A paper describes a structure:
The type VI secretion system is a widespread mechanism found in more than a quarter of all sequenced Gram-negative bacteria, with one or several copies in each species. The baseplate-sheath structure is anchored to the cell trans-envelope via a membrane-associated complex. TagL interacts with the TssJLM membrane complex through a direct interaction with TssL.
In this study, we solved the structure of the PGBD of the EAEC TagL protein. A sequence alignment with selected sequences corresponding to known structures (OmpA and Pal from Acinetobacter baumannii, and Pal from Yersinia pestis) showed that the TagL PGBD is restricted between residues Thr440 and Pro552. The structure of the TagL PGBD consists of three α-helices around a four-stranded β-sheet with connectivity β1-α1-β2-α2-β3-α3-β4, β4 being antiparallel to the other β-strands. The surface of the PGBD exhibits a deep crevice defined by three loops: Lβ1-α1, Lβ2-α2 and Lβ3-α3. Among the five residues that were previously shown to be required for TagL binding to the cell wall (Asn494, Leu497, Ser498, Arg501 and Ala502), the residues Asn494, Leu497 and Arg501 locate in this crevice. Nevertheless, the residues forming the DAP binding site are relatively conserved in TagL, especially the residues that interact with the DAP residue through hydrogen bonds and hydrophobic contacts: Asp486, Asn494, Leu 497 and Arg501. As expected, the structure is highly similar to other members of the family; most importantly, the PG binding pocket is conserved as the residues involved in DAP interaction are structurally conserved, which strongly suggests that TagL binds to PG through DAP interaction in the same way as other members of the OmpA/Pal/MotB family.
Numbering used by the authors: 441 to 552
Write the structure that this text describes.
């Protein structure tokens, strides 16, 4: 089960954007429906900056979404597996714009 993308990050940030909670809650409801599944949290970035820093930054966005569901959703940290894609695999053109915001995201997939 692949959950709706979570574009919750501003440029250079791994902390959640204002307005992010409503979307994290929607994802948390979907996780509560699949109790016991492996929760794979895959982080992404836009093209701006060095690709290796973007790889590191993508892992931190994945860890932040994981710790929100761990502490603000009461789910054991052992249920998650954090992943980072860096700037590879963009969903929209990275020439700044709203597309670059679409690339600063976290994809959650549930593995039975």
């Amino acid at each position: 089960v692949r959950l709706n993308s979570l574009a919750l990050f501003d440029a250079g940030k791994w902390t959640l954007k204002p307005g992010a909670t409503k979307w994290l809650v929607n994802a948390l409801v979907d996780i509560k429906a699949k109790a016991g599944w492996l929760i794979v949290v895959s982080g992404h970035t836009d093209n701006t900056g060095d690709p290796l820093r973007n790889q590191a930054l993508s892992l931190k966005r994945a860890e932040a979404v994981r710790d929100w569901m761990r502490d603000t959703g009461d789910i054991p940290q052992s249920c998650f597996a954090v992943q980072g894609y860096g700037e590879s695999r963009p969903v929209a053109p990275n020439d700044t714009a709203e597309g670059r915001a679409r690339n600063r995201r976290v994809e959650i997939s549930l593995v039975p």
